[PDB]
Amino acid sequence: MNFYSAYQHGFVRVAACTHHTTIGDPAANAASVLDMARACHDDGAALAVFPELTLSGYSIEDVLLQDSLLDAVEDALLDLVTESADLLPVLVVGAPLRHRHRIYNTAVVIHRGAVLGVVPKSYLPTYREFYERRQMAPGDGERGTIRIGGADVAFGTDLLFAASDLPGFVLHVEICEDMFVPMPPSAEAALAGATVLANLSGSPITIGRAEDRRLLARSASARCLAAYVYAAAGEGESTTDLAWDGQTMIWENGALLAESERFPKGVRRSVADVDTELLRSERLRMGTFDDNRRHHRELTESFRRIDFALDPPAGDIGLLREVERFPFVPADPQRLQQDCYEAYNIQVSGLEQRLRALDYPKVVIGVSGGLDSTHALIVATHAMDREGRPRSDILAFALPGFKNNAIKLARALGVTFSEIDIGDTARLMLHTIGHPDVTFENVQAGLRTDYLFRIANQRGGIVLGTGDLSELALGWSTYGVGDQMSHYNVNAGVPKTLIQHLIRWVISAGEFGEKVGEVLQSVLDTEISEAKVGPFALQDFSLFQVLRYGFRPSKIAFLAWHAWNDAERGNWPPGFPKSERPSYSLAEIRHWLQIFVQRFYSFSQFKRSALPNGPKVSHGGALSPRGDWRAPSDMSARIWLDQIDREVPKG
Amino acid sequence: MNFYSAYQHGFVRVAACTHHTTIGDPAANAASVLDMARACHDDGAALAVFPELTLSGYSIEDVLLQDSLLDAVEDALLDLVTESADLLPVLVVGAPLRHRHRIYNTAVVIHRGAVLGVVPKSYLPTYREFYERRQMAPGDGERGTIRIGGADVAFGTDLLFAASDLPGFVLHVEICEDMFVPMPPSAEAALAGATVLANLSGSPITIGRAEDRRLLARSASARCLAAYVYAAAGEGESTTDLAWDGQTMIWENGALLAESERFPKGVRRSVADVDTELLRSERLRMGTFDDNRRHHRELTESFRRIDFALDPPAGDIGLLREVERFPFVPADPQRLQQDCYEAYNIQVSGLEQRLRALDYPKVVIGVSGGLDSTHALIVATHAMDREGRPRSDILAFALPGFKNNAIKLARALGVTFSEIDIGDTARLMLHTIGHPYSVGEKVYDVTFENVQAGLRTDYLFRIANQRGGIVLGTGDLSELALGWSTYGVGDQMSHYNVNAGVPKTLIQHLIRWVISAGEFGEKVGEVLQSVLDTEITSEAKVGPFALQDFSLFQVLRYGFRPSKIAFLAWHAWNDAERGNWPPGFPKSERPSYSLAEIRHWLQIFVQRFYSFSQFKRSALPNGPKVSHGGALSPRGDWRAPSDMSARIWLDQIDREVPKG
Amino acid sequence: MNFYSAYQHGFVRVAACTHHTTIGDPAANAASVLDMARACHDDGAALAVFPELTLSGYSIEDVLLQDSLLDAVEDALLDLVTESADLLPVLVVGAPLRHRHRIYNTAVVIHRGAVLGVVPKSYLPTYREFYERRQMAPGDGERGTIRIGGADVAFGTDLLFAASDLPGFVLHVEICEDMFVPMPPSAEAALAGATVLANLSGSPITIGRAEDRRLLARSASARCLAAYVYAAAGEGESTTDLAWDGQTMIWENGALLAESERFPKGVRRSVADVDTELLRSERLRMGTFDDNRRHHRELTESFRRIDFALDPPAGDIGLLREVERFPFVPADPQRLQQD
Ligand SMILES: NC(=O)c1ccc[n+]([C@@H]2O[C@H](COP(=O)([O-])OP(=O)(O)OC[C@H]3O[C@@H](n4cnc5c(N)ncnc54)[C@H](O)[C@@H]3O)[C@@H](O)[C@H]2O)c1
Ligand SMILES: NC(=O)c1ccc[n+]([C@@H]2O[C@H](COP(=O)([O-])OP(=O)(O)OC[C@H]3O[C@@H](n4cnc5c(N)ncnc54)[C@H](O)[C@@H]3O)[C@@H](O)[C@H]2O)c1
Ligand SMILES: Nc1ncnc2c1ncn2[C@@H]1O[C@H](COP(=O)(O)O)[C@@H](O)[C@H]1O
Ligand SMILES: Nc1ncnc2c1ncn2[C@@H]1O[C@H](COP(=O)(O)O)[C@@H](O)[C@H]1O
């Protein structure tokens, strides 16, 4: 295998281009197109979308009806088709074309020397600044073929272009207005199997229109679990009554992959690697999407599927994609602030309801001064405050076996604090079972929980769990009698990599006062097992890929390596001093991934199977056997380990 | 409300009748029909099905084509219809009827003075002893109306008769051979909404045919989540070439409600109360059934629905239904032997797989000499045997706090036995959390009980880490149902629970089953017997398990409302002499329960099951489903909130169940 | 004329409500609904949308299949219907209801003492944290009627509720997931004449989900030239595995009219005056919208139109709407910089 090849990992590189329009001069337009397409080829792109009516210019009005213009358009089209014999990408080029009685506003789908299909715009705006019905006919419901350079090629709104050697890539094409009506051709296309939706746009620019284009491309890409590739007209279009901004953009399932400078001087491209496996995975999981298709079975089975062989490049062509280091921790500070606000409120409101339902039990929690319990204590306190409960009904315990932050935190919040030395009970228990270990660690971990549960019976409380999602993922907890067990776990949904940011978020908001903030800060400074289970930054990364998308190990390694191999590349969330910004080699990423698949798929499930209650937090998922993760407690991880042996280089 | 009314609890009483045939004499047949129907009326039946071609006799061949016969059939039908003005049940009577060009083999659905519909047989056998196509036309695909006694009434294979004041009762009718073809009219009818499927049969009798009729009525009632009411011809049919057996039967979702004497002298009826709520509940739950309907949407939306008002009796008319005392413990010894065999093998194989998957850990189990742990030890032993594991890899512990059966059993099986006194650890813990007992006060608290319960589990878990084993849970289904366990650190928790699916009422019969098979030898059997003798004679606070296991089954399988469960349990349990007891209830341990008691324990049940206990089931260790009634895994049969009140159930009991 | 009357100028006042859920207690839920609906009445609202499965609570799982729960739901529904004789707004209340073989996840459209229609959810998520297919049947393609308190009322995904004395107000109802699939029932409804699209949502909250709800409600309102009224479940839903944020919002042709506090303590409403003339005008001008309808003529002519008379208040009830002084000059500095 070629492990560094984006194409071998299910990416398809796509381009949205804005060329230089020369109105009423198809030769000139074709030349600009040819030159941009050659760039896309050099970039290893599989697809290159151009603006509405590329070969004539969108804005020429009744000049679209002139024989000499239409004849010149055909001539130029045929030259492009001939040039395309040598170009890698599928070109989607706009052109006014004669068919039957009229000219249609069409997108010509071109590939390796042939026209694959010709797709007419369905809805022609004839209102405000738009007069398209005057010159051009609507495409909705046209089928059949059209004769282009002595060949009959598929013509109509119902076409799909499927790469025979790259099945994740199935192209559908619509045109500008098409995406703005209640029931866009692209939405039926997605249900029928289209994964990459192209839009050629003319779209003169006005205040607020760029937002409208975004709103609709973004929502389409999200609602149809698809990439949406959009190209609008720019410099060169007539400014008789309108101006043009050249916007290009590429969306993927609601996320912006790329966009280009608005009002550029010169031509611009958006180029991005679309993850066809992502779309595959989203669709495999959201059964209601298939249900929608079956309900519109007639609409969706009637698409004609045109095949082509892409034969993309096999080598290292980089990865034109922003892979964030912390799938659970957004690098953008505004976005991170928002996530924290949500995570915190989820945790709190999860706990408020349990407490309301139990008519306000005391809250029993083991506080050790570490990140997890510190944060849980804070969550508990807020929940109690919001429910008008005295903080003294929170019972915090230090349980020393064989830290100062804990008592300082508890005194500062003003909950009830208490120490119980479990050492003697442990000594008694170790002696009673005849121990001279994991047994040694576990006797203490167990007795901590045993004590808390009993205190909870005694004092009318519930025991608050504090184990985080990353520990659930790797089975890094003592199961049953031990920290795995509790009456309600507020941390169950929060991965370890997010925890430290919640604590800062709490400090930064300042709600608990200056003294509490200082202790919390101390906890952070002090606290920041990764020796045996690996760095949580890496295991949280793999967890997200597995839990959300079920990606194979080699795909996960590829992604993590692009995100993590170079500390200077990409973005870091706030709060990583340059001394704690590590980079990881492939060898490391591989290593921790072996530990991960073995622990996640095989070892740890029985511990998640009997999990106490607690709220889902991340869109990446949570690990409740009653919600996001239903799996066997008795399965081997052989095939994932084997996939790593076979597909991931040793370094 | 009227609490003792079967009808007010969702039952509909149905009859399958076999009359006296007088061939070629419709007046005589009608007179027999009228007299049987009056009986059904007196019984408060809603429905009375008669044999194929009732009014003429099935067996009269070309006499069916005689004008005078056909004319007399019509006259007799009209007299029935007139007499039916005063009759409670819907009558389904067979009759050869003229329509368009031919006579159809029909079933006339009659009610309170009117004909609701006429249903022609769809498939007319013309092979072997059957010549139906010679005299009569196929009904499949006939629709429209037929003119009967100056009224136009629905005619066709596509009809449903729905009780407007009793929505669980939607009738479809088919005739004999109809149920024998790959795609019977009744199967489409059920997808369309029919819940009670009638079959009028002629069906001359031959060796093995009664089995065939059963196979097909039973499977239809099961596959269609319906009652199936069946009536065949008997005495009086011609014996020119055939004999007749008069078989009648009533099925419900695969179970036999009732059947009559074969080859009777005189007329016979099967009468039974069909539970429409049971059918409702099964259908509510089996979504693939509704999926089937949607797939045959065109077929199923094209049914015509004819409404009638049954207005059944409101009072106490008893309950013609066998309600078993132990929904989990079949009274029939053969069936009970079979269930035990299955329960045991499920438990064992569930554990064998966990052990294989863990490369054969030692099995750690707390044995106290009680039923549950005794049984688990046995299960564990057999699992180890089948996997060729030494029994000494089973580590049994007695964990005395503040019985001989346990050590005797362990020594006899030859597992590794050991005692660990948890009292000192408990004393230390109780003192450390400052509990009054540690300072003398005799305060036998929930905390006091729980410190010991918890420490047992704590010890076993640590032993399991120490010695390379897993801890076997032993808590049974009835304890899961009621939250009768110590949660988390405590007996609720384990590595694998082989008893999780087994209700308490079944456990004692598993143990006997094990003894009875004898597989473990005479010494082991003697100790097991001793465990039974000792342990059978907390049911003070949570109630008798016979009652709670009863309510559990109703709730878990059907979601029945409390008053419905009280009605059922009262009919099963109020009288110790009535109904059957499984094997092994000496007459001194055959209690009966009053309504007051049944009510009382049901309040405790709904509160504990719907509200209190769910959190303890929510974090449940692994273990195999056993009963068709269901199991309580939050990953399987029971998905429910851990933080809900049971107010509405408690209220339903207040409102609907009399105080005594 | 009454010149200060929002209703006489083609506004229709609408509410999205988040009540207090008491799981498995329909009487309690109905009481909270009744109390919120009375507020909406006092505000002169024409429409009040509640969260998914309002009368039972969304999150109760297999408890939805218990006879006593389903029976209590019906009883409570009938009381609401009776109370609604005296209430101005159309209520849209969620309820698990028996029909044919199964329970449907339904929205009951209630008005002045009668049920106008019962609309089943079309797409039932059964993936990740969602298990709806286990307990409930899909509504897509169900038509006919359902029997509710001794009346047969329209049942199905194809319903429109049109105010006979206020023609700009034509209601269509869908449920949570319905707006998330490529071809939402609401998009066909708009082409057929719906101008106000309601969504009852359960929607447990997770990081980023509020944005997803916004993205999809906003885009729907814009793509369908319509008001979109959205109500999600909050306090009271089970937190066995999930938390709930009580978000309510009202969109109009891509613009946010109103939204409510997320994670509120107590019940919240979004109330706004929707401009039916605005939607009328947008639609009159964008001929491609009508072209889309003609292309899906079969889909769009098959809607059943249920009529009702709103008879809204004629007087001055203010105007719950932000009318900017400078239509050409946005008051928000970030937006103005961009323009
Ligand atoms: N940071 C934390 O949250 C935390 C807390 C405690 C321990 N730890 C770490 O993890 C370790 C805990 O050790 P552990 O996981 O070996 O102890 P554990 O008791 O949680 O898990 C092993 C136990 O479960 C049983 N088991 C294993 N697989 C099973 C399966 N499929 N089904 C049923 N039972 C199964 C084993 O026989 C054994 O009794 C510590 O030594 C330490 O390294 C971390
Ligand atoms: N034979 C057996 O199987 C067995 C064994 C031990 C005890 N028991 C019986 O059961 C009793 C156990 O008592 P118990 O059930 O009160 O103790 P428990 O510890 O099992 O349960 C109560 C504990 O759970 C918490 N809790 C209650 N509802 C909760 C919820 N909805 N969510 C989260 N946490 C919740 C309470 O705050 C308390 O800490 C004993 O007294 C005894 O009668 C039976
Ligand atoms: N020394 C301690 N005192 C009180 N609580 C503790 C102590 N150690 C651990 N805990 C609790 O048990 C959990 C286990 O932490 P750990 O095994 O160290 O990652 C912590 O998150 C606390 O909730
Ligand atoms: N005295 C005991 N000795 C050994 N095991 C016990 C003892 N008491 C309880 N157990 C274990 O805990 C389970 C719960 O029983 P109990 O709490 O006594 O009703 C039993 O089935 C045993 O597995």
Ligand SMILES: N[C@@H](CCC(=O)O)C(=O)O
């Ligand atoms: N329907 C949009 C189209 C916007 C565009 O073409 O970019 C309009 O108002 O014209």
Ligand SMILES: N[C@@H](CCC(=O)O)C(=O)O
């Ligand atoms: N098809 C069956 C008919 C049985 C019956 O009609 O009862 C046969 O072999 O004759």
Ligand SMILES: N[C@@H](CCC(=O)O)C(=O)O
């Ligand atoms: N289709 C969305 C639904 C989100 C919601 O229900 O709010 C999902 O991922 O579950």
